């Protein structure tokens, strides 16, 4: 369930630069915050499949997809 209700927050929950776009520079900070010591295959491997735009970040579209009610 949850719906876009939780997804909306998640986006910001992940956004630490208040820009409306997540980046790798932040991702790592997200992991180290929830448990560093994470292989590099978890930062890119995750972003890659979450970077349909291939810009090095996430959007309100791709994010809403990869963020199908996470956390
Ligand atoms: C409790 O322990 C953890 C907490 C968060 C993470 C974590 O990195 N998570 C948790 C769920 C949301 C989440 C989303 C992403 C993303 N990936 N891909 C996208 O396209 S959007 C978004 C930026 C990347 C990582 C994580 C990992 C943990 O252990 C493996
Ligand atoms: Ca951000
Ligand atoms: Ca993207």
What does this entry look like structurally?
This is Troponin C, slow skeletal and cardiac muscles. Helices cover 46% and strands 6% of the residues. The chain has 71 residues and is mainly α. The protein has a single domain (1-71), classed as Recoverin, domain 1. The radius of gyration is 12 Å and the shape is globular. Bound molecules: ligand EMD and calcium ion (2 copies).
How would you summarize the topology of this molecule?
Elements (H helix, E strand, L loop, with lengths): L3 H11 L7 E2 H12 L8 H5 L8 E2 L3 H5 L5
Antiparallel strand pairs: 1-2
Bound molecules: the ligand COc1ccc(C(=O)N2CCCc3cc(C4=NNC(=O)S[C@@H]4C)ccc32)cc1OC and calcium ion (CA) (2 copies).
Query: How many helices in DSSP terms?
Result: 4
Return the CATH topology.
Recoverin, domain 1
In terms of DSSP E residues, the strand content is 5-15%
Class by SSE composition: mainly alpha
Strands side by side in the biggest sheet: 1-2
Binding site for Ca(2+) 2: 15, 17, 19, 21, 26
GO biological process, one term: transition between fast and slow fiber
Protein name: Troponin C, slow skeletal and cardiac muscles
Modified residues (Phosphoserine): 8
